[PDB]
Ligand binder design. Sequence first.
Ligand SMILES: Nc1ncnc2c1ncn2[C@@H]1O[C@H](COP(=O)(O)OP(=O)(O)OP(=O)(O)O)[C@@H](O)[C@H]1O
Lengths: 176, 351, 84
Amino acid sequence: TLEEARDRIRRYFPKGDPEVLQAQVERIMTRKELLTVYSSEDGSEEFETIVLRALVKACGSSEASAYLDELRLAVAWNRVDIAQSELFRGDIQWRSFHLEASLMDALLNDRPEFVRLLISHGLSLGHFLTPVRLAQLYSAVSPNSLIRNLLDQASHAPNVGQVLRTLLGETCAPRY
Amino acid sequence: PKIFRKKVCTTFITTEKPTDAYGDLDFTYSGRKHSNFLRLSDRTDPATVYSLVTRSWGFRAPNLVVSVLGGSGGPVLQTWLQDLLRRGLVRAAQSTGAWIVTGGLHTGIGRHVGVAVRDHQTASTGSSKVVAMGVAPWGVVRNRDMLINPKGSFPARYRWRGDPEDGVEFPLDYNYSAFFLVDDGTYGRLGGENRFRLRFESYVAQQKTGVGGTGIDIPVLLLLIDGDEKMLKRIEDATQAQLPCLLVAGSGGAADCLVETLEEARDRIRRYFPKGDPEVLQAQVERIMTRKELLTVYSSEDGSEEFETIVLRALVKACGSSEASAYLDELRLAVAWNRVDIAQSELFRGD
Amino acid sequence: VHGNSDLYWKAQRYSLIREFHSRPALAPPLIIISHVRLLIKWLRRLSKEAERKLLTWESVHKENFLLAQARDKRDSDSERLKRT
Ligand SMILES: Nc1ncnc2c1ncn2[C@@H]1O[C@H](COP(=O)(O)OP(=O)(O)OP(=O)(O)O)[C@@H](O)[C@H]1O
């Protein structure tokens, strides 16, 4: 990847089988983008960044889908220090739904610092809270929890307002 | 009192009529606090504009006024210049206490300044906001037809972000504290608002800093980014009123003035930054060199706390005649900005 | 015991005031005419902008409280040792 003589290159790393393995070099250069190099840039926290650069380079077709995947993977790995200093420098013009998708990934999982980070970059929650998204927030409930049993009893007759009424009564209880 | 804001300011259509749009404007479904608002005509007296600001709406007196110009790079600016706008300008306006006079639209400079104001308010807890003010023509406003009802102190639910159409009407940035919408009744032209901008900044540069005045005159500096031809005509209309300027290193007319201050061929210099109109703009270069002292350079010396020192060096260089009055003005401005660390290490060295 | 008894008394003191507020408004000897009034009644069967000015005032004090708490946390010696 830094660059006949290539058959001579084959004739000292295994010392054997020149032309079949030369066809393997041909198929290596058919891909050309799923191969990365670690040797030039070495470091401790450089490794996870090189993993991200390998995933960005092998993404290919769309650019905005590549930066969307890099942001949502930084949410998935629970690392704010990558996304703050490598995704919000100012090179990428972030749109709305690019931030709303990662906000849903930061609400469904328990990452509070991404919630504060993504709200601070100019997102409007009056447009964000679709009632389908609110149903998806109350969907992500552990099966051995308390509200899993309480929301099952509220579906006997989501149904959050009935749960608040059976806890707090008529008074002292919000609507929805 | 609420009708008083309509009985003072009038608007022409040129058939002149008393105005009907004073606003406690807020944004729909958004966090930002109510903002002040006024629709105004052109060629009005800036004295009642200023008395509206510091008496009726309620804003303190400026210790500095820095108006930012340019608008060459449309959607995306260089991140080096985003470092300049965020960590050079807005935190200096937070510390010294200053007004930023920028176009209140979402296009060009007002978008980038609004990014810098929002990012600085997020990543800093100083318990005080950055007063940024916006001037823009009434004809380019996206939702100018909502702001009519003259009842009083009304929060008009200004629908930003809606009906995305490009090129003709522009929405209001929510990163501004007060809006001055100057009307010519044209409804679509770009704006003859440069005269009102020069008269308002000249009137601010007349007044005095402090409690009952009794201080120095408020310094007014102009910051340029790359810009166009009409920005250089805006340079000359600025520097006839004795207002200093400051130049950045990016491209455009700003770097044109940089390289022209670093040193026929000058007409060839004119024939690639706009690629047009050689001899009229060559006469503009002639008037630039008539001033020669109200122009400073930022590119050679860059730094975080270097910015406020460069503002002081621009004010010292443009002072001119007397030396002792220049150092007196530098000391009393360091008192006015409430910064001991400048005056101790730059005014009491021993020179 | 004296501290927990004073906290318990201060909490119940609202319930005692509230139950003298909702009584028949006469002395016990004369309450029979108010139970007759209640028995025949049984047999027959802040503005908006003042609220907004109130809640914006509350939000101002909430923002000052959170900023002063953050500045007191940042200037502590342990956090300054972390930044050093
Ligand atoms: N009228 C406005 N004034 C100031 N800032 C705005 C305005 N509208 C959007 N923004 C900021 O710009 C960002 C979005 O940019 P832009 O307006 O180009 O796209 P968008 O409106 O999100 O697109 P969509 O129409 O899909 O919502 C948001 O994070 C928001 O904070």
